[PDB]
């Protein structure tokens, strides 16, 4: 019973560190939709880790897919349900096909801009 | 060992249903900062569950506290760390003092606009 309590604290730290990386990834993909960012990554002109347009469009569509606008025919609860599953499959490092890539490479690709420098202190 | 796998599926559904309610609450507090909303709840003029200004300012400051703008002196990773903890203390129904209310009443108050009607199909 003593080791049963040590596992509860570890999961709380895991689900919290997840929630931290969540909002980080949300911040990355929201400002990613800006146009001055995608043109900046054309050759990395202001601290952007260079990325070809194939790898850009991979997640530029994911940003549209993961942080979308509400469908008036869809309840805004089940919209978040769909968006929440996308985020969850991303952290799992799964290999389900999505927009032409894999969820494992998605986390790696987004982790590349989670240490780039464009993700903090940007216009 | 068989019952150990049934618990993993239940936690996955719990952490997913959490992630669903998360983004719902984020959507509630983001559009909450709009001015046409707080003036609408002055007497519920377009489907708004009436709320006095004490109970409004409780969460109108929480929205500023929970979905803020980045501090240039703070790394945008630890900013999300702080915001993630606020969301997590909210779902726990805790009783820590915050902006003059309690986290248990916060979830109840926000659950009142999670079934109101102003939270779907709004300008």
Residue numbers in the entry:
A (entry chain A), B (entry chain A): 196 to 318
What did the paper state?
Human Caprin family comprises two members, Caprin-1 and Caprin-2. Previously, we reported Caprin-2 as a new regulator of canonical Wnt signaling through a mechanism of facilitating LRP5/6 phosphorylation. HR1 domain is so far only observed in Caprin-1 and Caprin-2, and this domain shares no sequence similarities with any other known motifs, indicating that HR1 may perform a unique function.
We then tried the corresponding region of hCap2_HR1 (aa S102–K351) based on sequence alignment between hCaprin-2 and zCaprin-2, and this hCap2_HR1 protein was crystallized with significantly improved diffractions. Two molecules of hCap2_HR1 form an asymmetric dimer, with the overall structure roughly resembling the shape of a pair of "scissors" measuring ∼100 Å in height and ∼60 Å in width. The structure of hCap2_HR1 could be divided into two subdomains: a "blade"-like N-lobe (aa A112-L205) and a "bow"-like C-lobe (aa K206-P320). The parts of helices α3-2 and α3′ in the C-lobe of chains A and B, respectively, packed together forming a parallel coiled-coil dimer with the rest helices in the N-lobe forming two antiparallel dimers. The dimeric interface has a total buried area of 2414.4 Å2. Considering the theoretical MW of Cap2_HR1 being 29.2 kDa, we tend to conclude that Cap2_HR exists as a dimer in solution. Close to the junction of the N-lobe and the C-lobe, a cluster of basic residues aligned along the solve-exposed side of the coiled coil of the N-lobe. Surprisingly, we found that Cap2_HR1 binds specifically to phosphatidylinositol 4-phosphate (PI4P), and mutations targeting R200 and R201 in this basic cluster not only disrupt Caprin-2's association with PI4P but also lead to altered cellular localization as well as decreased activities of Caprin-2 in canonical Wnt signaling. WT hCap2_HR1 exhibited a binding affinity with PI4P (KD = 2.0 μm), which is about 70-fold higher than that of the double mutant R200E/R201E (KD = 152 μm).
